[PDB]
Design a protein around this ligand. Structure first.
Ligand SMILES: [Br-]
Ligand SMILES: [Br-]
Ligand SMILES: [Br-]
Ligand SMILES: [Br-]
Ligand SMILES: [Br-]
Ligand SMILES: [Br-]
Ligand SMILES: [Br-]
Ligand SMILES: [Br-]
Ligand SMILES: [Br-]
Ligand SMILES: [Br-]
Ligand SMILES: [Br-]
Ligand SMILES: [Br-]
Ligand SMILES: [Br-]
Ligand SMILES: [Br-]
Ligand SMILES: [Br-]
Ligand SMILES: [Br-]
Ligand SMILES: [Br-]
Ligand SMILES: [Br-]
Ligand SMILES: [Br-]
Length: 229
């Protein structure tokens, strides 16, 4: 994981109670933190899964009037039209692939790893899973979008994650990332990957955040795809 990406602390971690036979790598969004997500995932933790919430390098963010904060990549705007930080997204994807590889070198195979995240961290989880040849168990993409959408095929993507399971979650009251982004993303994902394994859930009254019912759907998705043994 490259130089900007090892400026941060080691990830916030929820350990497995038993020995860990699977992992969830969960990427936060602008503002929310690795720590905050680790406390959320503690509430749904499985005895054999380790939950890894890495920290993003601290860098000015254009959307936030150039204030320096943890950020996987720059965000310029959140309209469907907005220009995107292509090079930063690709760079961040290579670091996330490196992070998956660190779990693989520690004994947990990539097909026992779910990658997920919130807002630009969910966008990055989708981008990363659809562009890596590491086979992953699934993706949880919460209140987000598919970055660099026009760079993707108009049909199936093929390669290792062509049949990956994806749960995409969105709030119906999100004032930052419009529900339309979630919708247009699930549409695009049903052409990129096998649509049998793509599920879209929306939450009434949820804004740009998670909620308890969403965390229960995320738990059921993770647990079913990463069962014991
Ligand atoms: Br540390
Ligand atoms: Br562990
Ligand atoms: Br282990
Ligand atoms: Br937080
Ligand atoms: Br890291
Ligand atoms: Br952070
Ligand atoms: Br565009
Ligand atoms: Br974001
Ligand atoms: Br693009
Ligand atoms: Br399948
Ligand atoms: Br509201
Ligand atoms: Br609102
Ligand atoms: Br599924
Ligand atoms: Br669906
Ligand atoms: Br929340
Ligand atoms: Br709820
Ligand atoms: Br599901
Ligand atoms: Br197990
Ligand atoms: Br069980």
């Amino acid at each position: 994981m490259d130089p900007e990406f090892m400026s941060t602390p080691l990830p916030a971690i929820v350990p497995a109670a038993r020995k860990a036979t699977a992992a969830v790598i969960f990427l936060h969004g602008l503002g929310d933190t690795g720590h905050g997500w680790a406390e959320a995932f503690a509430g749904i933790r499985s005895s054999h899964i380790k939950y890894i919430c890495p920290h993003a390098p601290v860098r000015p963010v254009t959307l936030n009037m150039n204030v320096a904060m943890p950020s996987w990549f720059d965000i310029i705007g959140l309209s469907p039209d907005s220009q995107e930080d292509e090079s930063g997204i690709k760079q961040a994807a290579e670091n996330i692939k490196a992070l998956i590889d660190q779990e693989v070198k520690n004994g947990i195979p990539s097909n026992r790893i779910i990658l997920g995240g919130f807002s630009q961290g969910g966008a990055l989880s989708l981008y990363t899973a659809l562009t890596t040849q590491q086979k992953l168990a699934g993706v949880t993409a919460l209140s987000c979008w598919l970055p660099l959408r026009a760079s993707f095929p108009q049909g199936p993507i093929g390669g290792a994650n062509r049949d990956i399971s994806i749960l995409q979650c969105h709030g119906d009251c999100d004032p930052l990332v419009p529900l339309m982004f979630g919708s247009l993303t699930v549409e695009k994902l049903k052409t990129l990957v096998n649509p049998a394994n793509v599920t879209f859930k929306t939450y009434e009254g949820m804004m740009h955040s998670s909620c308890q019912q969403e965390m229960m759907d995320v738990k059921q998705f993770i647990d079913k795809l990463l069962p014991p043994i």
